Amino acid sequence: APPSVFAEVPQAQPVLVFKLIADFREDPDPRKVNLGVGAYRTDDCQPWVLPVVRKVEQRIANNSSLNHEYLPILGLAEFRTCASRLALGDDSPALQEKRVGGVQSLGGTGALRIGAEFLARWYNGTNNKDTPVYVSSPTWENHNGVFTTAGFKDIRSYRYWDTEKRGLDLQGFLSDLENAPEFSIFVLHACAHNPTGTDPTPEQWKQIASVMKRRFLFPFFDSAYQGFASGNLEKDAWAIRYFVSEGFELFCAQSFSKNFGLYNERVGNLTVVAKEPDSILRVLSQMQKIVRVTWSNPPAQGARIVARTLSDPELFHEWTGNVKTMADRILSMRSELRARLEALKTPGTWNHITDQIGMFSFTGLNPKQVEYLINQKHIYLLPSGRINMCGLTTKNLDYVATSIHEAVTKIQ
Residues 377-396 contacting ligand PLA, CB under 6 A:
none
Residue 323 or 353 with smaller CB distance to its own copies: 323
| Interface characters, 289-328, with ligand PLA (x: CB under 6 A) | -------x--------------------------------
- The residues, ordered by sequence, that sit 6+ positions from 202 with a Cβ below 8 Å of its Cβ are 238, 239, 242
Say whether 38 counts as a known binding-site residue.
Answer: yes
Q: Which is nearer to ligand PLA, 114 or 224 (CB)?
A: 224
Q: How many angstroms separate the first and last alpha carbons of the chain?
A: 55
How many angstroms separate the CA atoms of 204 and 161, rounded? 14
- Whole-angstrom distance, CA of residue 77 vs CA of residue 81: 6
Tell me if residue 270 falls in helix, strand or coil. Answer: strand
275 given a catalytic annotation: no
Interface residue with ligand PLA among 102, 107, 298, 358 (CB under 6 A) is: 107
Whole-number minimum distance, CB 134 to ligand PLA, in Å? 15
Nearest to its own copies of 198, 254 (CB atom): 254
Q: How far apart are CA 39 and CA 36, in angstroms?
A: 8
Is 194 a binder of ligand PLA (CB under 6 A)?
A: yes
* 109 interacts with ligand PLA by CB under 6 A: yes
Residue 1: burial class (beta carbons within 10 Å; 0-12, 13-18, 19+): exposed
Assess 268 for contact with ligand PLA (CB under 6 A). yes
Min dist CB 77 to ligand PLA, Å, is 19
If one asks whether residue 105 binds ligand PLA (CB under 6 A), the answer comes out as: no
Distance CA 168, CA 86 (A): 27
Q: Is 140 annotated as a binding residue?
A: yes
Could you give the residue ranges of the DSSP H alpha helices within 344-396?
Answer: 351-355, 367-372
Phi (first) and psi of residue 136, to 5 degrees: -75, 160
- Is 194 annotated as belonging to a binding site? yes
3-class DSSP assignment, residue 108: helix
**Shortest distance (Å) from residue 97 CB to ligand PLA:** 28
Is 21 a residue that touches ligand PLA (CB under 6 A)?
no
- Whether residue 241 contacts residue 89, with contact meaning beta carbons closer than 8 Å, is answered with yes
User: Which listed option, its own copies, ligand PLA, none, makes contact with residue 206 (CB within 5 to 8 Å by class)?
Assistant: none
* Cβ-based nearer residue to ligand PLA, 287 or 408: 287
Q: For this structure, is 258 an active site residue?
A: yes
Distance CA 201, CA 193 (A): 12
Does the annotation count 153 as an active-site position? no
Alpha helices in 293-396 (DSSP H): 301-310, 313-343, 351-355, 367-372
Closer Cβ to its own copies, 19 or 317, answer by number = 19
Distance CA 197, CA 333 (A): 14
Quote the CA–CA distance of 411 and 150 in Å, as a whole number: 41
Catalytic-labelled residue, pool 258, 319, 350, 377? 258
Binding residues for L-aspartate: 38, 140, 194, 386
Binding residues: 38, 140, 194, 386
**Binding positions for ligand PLA, rule: CB under 6 A:** 17, 37-38, 107-109, 140, 189, 194, 222, 224, 255, 257, 268, 296
Annotated catalytic sites, by residue? 140, 222, 258
